[PDB]
Design an enzyme around this catalytic site. Structure first.
Site, PDB file in Angstrom:
ATOM      1  N   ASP A 188      -4.935   7.219  -3.870  1.00  0.00           N
ATOM      2  CA  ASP A 188      -4.564   5.854  -4.251  1.00  0.00           C
ATOM      3  C   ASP A 188      -5.046   5.493  -5.662  1.00  0.00           C
ATOM      4  OD1 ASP A 188      -7.364   5.066  -3.678  1.00  0.00           O
ATOM      5  OD2 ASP A 188      -6.749   5.066  -1.573  1.00  0.00           O
TER       6      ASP A 188
ATOM      7  N   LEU B  78      -7.543   6.181   6.005  1.00  0.00           N
ATOM      8  CA  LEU B  78      -8.587   7.063   5.487  1.00  0.00           C
ATOM      9  C   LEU B  78      -9.295   7.720   6.672  1.00  0.00           C
ATOM     10  CD1 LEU B  78     -12.058   6.419   5.331  1.00  0.00           C
ATOM     11  CD2 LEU B  78     -11.080   4.141   5.082  1.00  0.00           C
TER      12      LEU B  78
ATOM     13  N   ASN C  68      -6.961 -21.079  -5.236  1.00  0.00           N
ATOM     14  CA  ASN C  68      -8.317 -20.545  -5.120  1.00  0.00           C
ATOM     15  C   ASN C  68      -8.368 -19.018  -5.146  1.00  0.00           C
ATOM     16  OD1 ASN C  68     -11.243 -20.377  -4.327  1.00  0.00           O
ATOM     17  ND2 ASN C  68     -10.916 -22.555  -3.889  1.00  0.00           N
TER      18      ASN C  68
ATOM     19  N   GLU D 233       0.822  -1.211   0.000  1.00  0.00           N
ATOM     20  CA  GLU D 233       0.000   0.000   0.000  1.00  0.00           C
ATOM     21  C   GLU D 233       0.859   1.266   0.000  1.00  0.00           C
ATOM     22  OE1 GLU D 233      -3.399  -0.106   2.865  1.00  0.00           O
ATOM     23  OE2 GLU D 233      -4.497  -0.220   0.972  1.00  0.00           O
TER      24      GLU D 233
ATOM     25  N   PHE E 190      -6.712  -4.477   5.278  1.00  0.00           N
ATOM     26  CA  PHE E 190      -6.307  -3.100   4.991  1.00  0.00           C
ATOM     27  C   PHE E 190      -6.827  -2.612   3.639  1.00  0.00           C
ATOM     28  CE2 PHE E 190      -3.709  -2.748   8.660  1.00  0.00           C
ATOM     29  CZ  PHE E 190      -3.173  -1.465   8.712  1.00  0.00           C
TER      30      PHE E 190
ATOM     31  N   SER F 170     -11.819 -20.184   0.385  1.00  0.00           N
ATOM     32  CA  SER F 170     -10.391 -19.957   0.596  1.00  0.00           C
ATOM     33  C   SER F 170     -10.028 -19.804   2.073  1.00  0.00           C
ATOM     34  CB  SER F 170      -9.924 -18.736  -0.195  1.00  0.00           C
ATOM     35  OG  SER F 170     -10.272 -18.859  -1.564  1.00  0.00           O
TER      36      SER F 170
END
Ligand SMILES: [N+]
Lengths: 93, 163, 86
Positions: free
Chosen positions: B21, B33, B133, B12, B105, B118
């Site tokens: 972003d 944020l 997966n 990130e 996140f 998953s």
């Protein structure tokens, strides 16, 4: 080889005034030098490091150059240990 | 390192001043944020409450670390509060825990909980199958950059995809 | 040549006492036809002697200092190996 007393194996910049005095007593015997008066270096290690070779010679006419070159050797070996611990700390992290 | 901080410093990213972003909303520090009002007016005001002091920011490198760590804490609490996520998370070791936080996140607690198959595969110590997966999902398509490393971490259980 | 080597001193200067250093100077002066060297020019053992630079030798002995330094290096070259000074 040069083997310092174990209590002096710290970087000279961290030396107390007493550490400096113990360094001289040790150096005198180790290097069979003429007796060095206790008050020839009334200062801590970070002060000691600001002195020139000429300053060592003025303070100790008999042994100043030996004491100076001894200090350079001590500084060098500590610098090596510092970059050996540095390269390894970056190797783990 | 490698550690949890390095993970999102790569994915990130840490940027300093306020940036936008890959979407449009304002983001400070590492994925924080901001930002409910459609302008840089209230994204400037909620930061006074968050940091403890004032203006604009432009915040210090260490305040963003604290900010990041408070958000990791928020992620963990959200995960453990979640009935669909907690049982998966509690069975995971800390390397794989970081990967699930990484996912939170980005797409948030509620978004991650949608990966039912998953998540169950990750719970039952079935790493490669969850890795195949997760690869066949909508999230994988948008940014294959971030996704490949999160998957690699889930399979091997190590930080290798970052070293 | 070369040899150029003291006959009654150890060939490893690191073991030299303060007295051994004085005898080395005495031998040196004779062997090399140097100007007279005052015994108290190197009031130190061999360990201390090996710490000095060529510059320090010159300061202590303006006439012969460089000679003595190279003489000390010559003694270290043959025989092997160390020390020195770590
Ligand atoms: N020397």
């Amino acid at each position: 080889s040069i083997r310092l007393p174990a209590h002096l194996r710290l970087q000279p910049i961290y030396w107390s005034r007493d550490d400096v005095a113990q360094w001289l007593k040790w150096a005198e015997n180790e290097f069979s030098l003429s007796p060095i008066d206790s008050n020839t270096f009334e200062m801590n290690g970070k002060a000691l490091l600001l002195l020139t070779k000429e300053d060592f010679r003025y303070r100790s006419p008999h042994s100043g150059d030996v004491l100076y070159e001894l200090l350079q050797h001590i500084l060098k070996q500590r610098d090596l240990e510092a970059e050996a611990a540095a390269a390894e700390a970056a190797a783990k992290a | 390192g490698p550690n949890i901080f390095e993970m999102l410093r790569i994915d990130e990213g840490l940027r300093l001043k306020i940036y936008k972003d890959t979407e449009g909303y304002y983001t400070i520090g590492i994925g924080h944020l901001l930002t409910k009002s459609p302008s840089l007016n209230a994204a400037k005001s909620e930061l006074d409450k968050a940091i403890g002091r004032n203006t604009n920011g432009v915040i210090t490198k260490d305040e963003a670390e604290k900010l990041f760590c408070q958000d990791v804490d928020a992620a963990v609490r959200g995960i453990l509060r979640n009935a669909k996520l907690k049982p998966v998370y509690d069975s995971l070791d800390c390397v794989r825990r970081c990967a699930l936080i990484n996912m939170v996140f980005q797409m948030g607690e509620t978004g991650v909980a949608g990966f039912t198959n998953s998540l169950r595969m990750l719970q039952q110590k079935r790493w490669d199958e969850a890795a195949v997966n997760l690869a066949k999902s909508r999230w994988y398509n948008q940014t294959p950059n971030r996704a490949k490393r999160v998957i690699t971490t889930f399979r091997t259980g190590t930080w290798d995809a970052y070293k």
